[PDB]
Amino acid sequence: EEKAARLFIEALEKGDPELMRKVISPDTEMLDNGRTFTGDEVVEYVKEIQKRGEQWHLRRYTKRGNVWLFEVQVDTEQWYVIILVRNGRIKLVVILTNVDEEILKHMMELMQRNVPIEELREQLEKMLS
Ligand SMILES: [Cl-]
Numbered sequence: 001e002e003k004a005a006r007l008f009i010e011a012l013e014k015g016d017p018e019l020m021r022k023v024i025s026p027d028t029e030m031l032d033n034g035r036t037f038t039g040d041e042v043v044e045y046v047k048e049i050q051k052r053g054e055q056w057h058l059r060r061y062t063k064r065g066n067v068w069l070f071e072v073q074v075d076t077e078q079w080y081v082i083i084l085v086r087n088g089r090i091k092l093v094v095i096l097t098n099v100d101e102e103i104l105k106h107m108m109e110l111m112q113r114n115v116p117i118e119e120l121r122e123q124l125e126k127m128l129s
């Protein structure tokens, strides 16, 4: 479970779609500051990082329940990658940039309760406007 989560970040870190492909599933859902990605689209996200050449640096992390919060510096912006793992598999990912700690805590709470991606997205939208 820890490995799943960490490898996901390392894929971002390293710009490695091949690695991402290993730990996601067709059911994986991701929200990147509002926009939605399902399954193999998460892999394409990593291609965009690599085929752009800005460096993602995993700085530090926390586990809360089944939710991991990774604090990434992007070359600096504070990016946050929040991950719900379930059964060896990444279920939900939220990526945010330069948001308040309250938003991170609120999103983590929603994810802990296995809220659908629709609710996660609407909740973000209400908070960022
Ligand atoms: Cl999609």
Ligand SMILES: [Cl-]
Pocket: 102, 103, 105, 106
């Ligand atoms: Cl809150």
Ligand SMILES: [Cl-]
Pocket: 106
């Ligand atoms: Cl809240």
